[PDB]
Design a protein around this ligand. Sequence first.
Ligand code: ZN
Ligand code: ZN
Ligand code: ZN
Lengths: 195, 158, 55, 50, 159, 303, 290
Amino acid sequence: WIPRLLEDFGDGGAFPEIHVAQYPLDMGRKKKMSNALAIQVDSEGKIKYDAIARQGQSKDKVIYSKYTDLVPKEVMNADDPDLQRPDEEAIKEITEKTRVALEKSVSQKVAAAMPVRAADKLAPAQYIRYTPSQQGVAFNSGAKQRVIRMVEMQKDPMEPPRFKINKKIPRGPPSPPAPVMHSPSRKMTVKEQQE
Amino acid sequence: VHLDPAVKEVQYNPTYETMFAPEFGPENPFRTQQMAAPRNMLSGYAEPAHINDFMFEQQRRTFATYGYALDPSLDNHQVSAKYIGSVEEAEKNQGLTVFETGQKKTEKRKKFKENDASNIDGFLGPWAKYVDEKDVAKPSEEEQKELDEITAKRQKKG
Amino acid sequence: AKTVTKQRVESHFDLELRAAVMHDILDMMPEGIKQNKARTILQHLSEAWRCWKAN
Amino acid sequence: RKRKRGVDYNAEIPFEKKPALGFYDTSEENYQALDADFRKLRQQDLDGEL
Amino acid sequence: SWQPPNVYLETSMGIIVLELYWKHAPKTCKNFAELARRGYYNGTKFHRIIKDFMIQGGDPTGTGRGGASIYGKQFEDELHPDLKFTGAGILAMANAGPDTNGSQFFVTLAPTQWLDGKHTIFGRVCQGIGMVNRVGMVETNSQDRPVDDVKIIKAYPSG
Amino acid sequence: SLQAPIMLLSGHEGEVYCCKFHPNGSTLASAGFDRLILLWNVYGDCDNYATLKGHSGAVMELHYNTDGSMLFSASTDKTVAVWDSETGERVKRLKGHTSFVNSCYPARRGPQLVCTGSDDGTVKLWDIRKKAAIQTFQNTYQVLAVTFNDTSDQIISGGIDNDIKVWDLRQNKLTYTMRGHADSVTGLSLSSEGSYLLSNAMDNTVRVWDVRPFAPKERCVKIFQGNVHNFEKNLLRCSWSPDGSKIAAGSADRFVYVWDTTSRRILYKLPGHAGSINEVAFHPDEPIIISASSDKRLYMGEI
Amino acid sequence: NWEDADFPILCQTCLGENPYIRMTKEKYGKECKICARPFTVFRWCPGVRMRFKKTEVCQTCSKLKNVCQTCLLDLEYGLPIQVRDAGLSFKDDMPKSDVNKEYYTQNMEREISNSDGTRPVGMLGKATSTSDMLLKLARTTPYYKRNRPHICSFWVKGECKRGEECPYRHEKPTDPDDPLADQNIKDRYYGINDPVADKLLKRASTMPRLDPPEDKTITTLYVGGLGDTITETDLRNHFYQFGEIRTITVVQRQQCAFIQFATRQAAEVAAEKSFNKLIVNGRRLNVKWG
Ligand SMILES: [Zn+2]
Ligand SMILES: [Zn+2]
Ligand SMILES: [Zn+2]
């Protein structure tokens, strides 16, 4: 029963009965704006130095940055249900998903080829229910939500293109560099360097 | 008490106990009014409604004519109904809409009529102007001079 | 994406020949080479073609 | 001045990429600007000897 | 109706020993010791982990809304005027509102005002604040859920 | 659970005002604002085969016979078309109302009878063999929902006077009035036993009323909550489960409520419906729920 | 690129006082006033005597800077961009010169399309740390006076031949001898020399704030406006956050409470956190030094 330090705490744990402002590890009240990304550790493994490799990638992106990714696996003896093409019905399912996904972009590309043969028609005038998320006593008037009727504007057939498109800017940065995973630099000799 | 909080689109038919139990624990303090509200894209939650056209435009024109309307919220404070607007005129005029025969009928405006189409340069069927309100609106006696002053101050710039 | 029609044919052939030679010398040099010296081998190839035409 | 590009060089950093940040706080530290000294400095001095 | 000392956790990251307060809240401690004894946490995970706030743990469904008790799904609170949420390591009972507690604990990481405003202090950690701080450094998402499994392997109502 | 997890029944161009399960339960037929009634086989792959046209209004009420061989539905143009389940042909049309027919019911067991109610304030009893009204009951306010007791002696009518009325076929008199709603009644339905009648209203409350030779005399047997009505003023209909254990009623908040018959506890409250829900129906053998709504889609929830 | 999005990003005093709104969607109607790449134009009428406002900038130029697409004011607080960047940091540094602007726009739009499409992309982590003075001059009620038709330029020359049918206002235009009348679009967007922002930050400078100890080390707190409906055993609980609390002198005859803490730092803090902000027991608790 004397906190007063980080020493008297043997292996941490602030006693909530002292009624002081003690704190076991350095959970400072005025932690400044630090731009370091958090040094995060996996379930029981090492410090994730993979986090400095995935700057602009997502969380499900699979990249290889460890030495365990360089060692060969075993012979994987025979007709094992591990190394199998997944399922013929799953193949048909992925085939159907992919053909439906590609035919839509095909139709959107092909719509340019004949612009107006049977010139366009539009009336799916619809409703959307919108919750403004910045609630005020007087702001909507008096309600949590508001309903908006959207009509697509009717396009003039006798109307040329509106804006310049030929403008061009240089190619942006590519995705974050992948680590190389190379072998250890086979040694070069002076004699072969001269030959 | 059985299901994930939000992933979406459950493949099995859920129970009321297994989907609408509240989340346990305290809220995190690291969110604002915009971040704590279940918003959809930067300014709130937008979902496709399917309201009847006539009833929508009825309440819309009722607000635009008077200043009150019913609440199109899904639940809100749970309750069968309430009105949203200038609430005092809703219970005053018993909550009528524009598409219904009105309670008030007084003080109609007066306009010309020459509905015969026989007298040339005298006919005005539905183009009849009001007898009281009149065309070109010259402003005032001092409004003119102060507008001349403000245009002169504009002239001292260019 | 301009088409190789009739007046681009020899220039496109000699454009692609250089590229195939560049890929082959990038694959042919061993691991500890300074990765320079491509232009000189391309000049040796042009001179070898001139010496073929001159017999 | 009658040109599209070109004035974008002194005004700001042209095609700026931010240095990738991680595992070390580097928000506090800063660099010191060059001494002007516009009574000795010459066009040859900035460039260096030929 | 016995009163064990400190409870041995065996999490995925390491071994944390929990010091539970038997005077100020004996009913939560008896319930928690019983749930640790029966094997109710062997395989449950730290479902809600917010950085520098707390680590919520203990759920057979692993959702943040499930759980029960040995009394059945609810029991009262023990809001004592001596225990106050200040400092890291404080072991607690997760809430849903007034006098409604299931089988979810949370170790608090920071001094807080609304916590001892509306929560009951179970106890504290005694051995293993480093592994707790490693659990605090786990990658999260929109709803502050971990990417990997930070689950508890075994548990002992020791002493 | 029988081959049903949830599915999706579509085809409708307008709000689906009503849908009922095949007496067999194998097949189904729905209809709504689209002036079309859809039959989709429930089993196998749930696909419609026979469509029944011949309606110049909103197929407001849709019903089935105990056998289910003959299906009769009520439209908004004041004319009711009777169509057999097999071959789908307008077989017996009865036209006696001066305004919109809001709802219809067919008497089970006893010789064929049909009741209708409309905006003209009247309730009419039809014998399918006569091509003429048998009895007419002038109320004075618009009638929204009507059902027969299992004895085929009484007609139960819900209107906009907040008061469910019971008519005696022999006396032709107002036998009973039920008080307990604060607003218009939109949907009535009898238990399979004859024992209880379920009501939805604009007063925000689902009420069960018990109809018996010996009645407590204040038949507010139970009250349930959750079901919301709003500015759309849609007719809302409710249904009894095959065994009378569950109560389903649609709402304008797109939530399929289903309470426990004995404990009045919300058993289900499923989502997946974009627009207001107009009717919820139970399969006669298996725990399958058909939900119909103004978003023009159907779901086959399985419990 | 194009933009092609559904349902614009709007505040509530631009979207009107009617909960029932009709708007039209035009697919690639105009160009952005900032980006100059064309976007989807949404156009509605706010109310009855209003102006038919439409969206002026892209979804992207409002994602980068957390504003409404037509008034270019904050979604959450409703203040100009220069004020909100003054009450925060300024680490966006969007380029204003041409090619750099379109290059930065392409790359940040790639970063947006390589994400969910819901958050402020760079403003989120600095939008966690908030509740500065900008919360204390945020407008509570909607300012519906913006949604208002322009001055009739035929009436200014005294030649408005429409008269009573003219939907444009017959009232005074603002005097151009005013800093408040220059107002470029891009100056309001990039947070450079916005005179509305100048007047708001000037109003801000005047406003009450927690102050430093008159003499060194003094953690003495002179607390005015206590009231006798409160208890001093709760103060401690609402104060302990800071650290071990030093002296706690109590006087209920003036209703003033003096306090003492270990360090002056904590006392400054308690001022800061506490001054012109704290209320407990539904009663304002006012603080001063000595
Ligand atoms: Zn833009
Ligand atoms: Zn705005
Ligand atoms: Zn005018």
